[PDB]
């Protein structure tokens, strides 16, 4: 599989995903901690997505680098 999972909000580069998983994933939530951005759209590779319960905005993708 291949699913880019950067920390910024615009990583068009490519990033294959290891492990026996197979997908792209992202979760976004607003939260003012220090000086970061607003909606933290963290990302990662998995079967469908992280263990989010959808309370967080999950965004997965069944294809090569998708969720930038």
Q: Which of 11, 41, 40, 36 shows the shortest CA–CA distance to 25?
A: 41
Technique behind the model:
NMR
Give the span between the Cα atoms of 33 and 50, in whole angstroms.
22
Please state the domain count of the chain.
Answer: 1
- Give me the CATH number covering residue 21: 2.10.60.10
Determine the structural domain holding residue 64 and report its residue range: 1-68
Place of tokens 């939260």: 31
**Chain position carrying tokens 């000086």:** 35
Question: Which three-class secondary structure string do you get for 1-32?
Answer: CECCCCCCCCCCCCCECCCCCCCEEEECCECC
């Amino acid at each position: 599989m291949q699913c880019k999972t950067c920390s910024f909000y615009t990583c068009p580069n490519s990033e294959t995903c290891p492990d026996g998983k197979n997908i792209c994933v992202k979760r976004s939530w607003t939260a003012v901690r220090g000086d970061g951005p607003k909606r933290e759209i963290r990302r990662e590779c998995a079967a469908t997505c992280p263990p989010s319960k959808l309370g967080l905005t999950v965004f997965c993708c069944t294809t090569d680098n998708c969720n930038h």
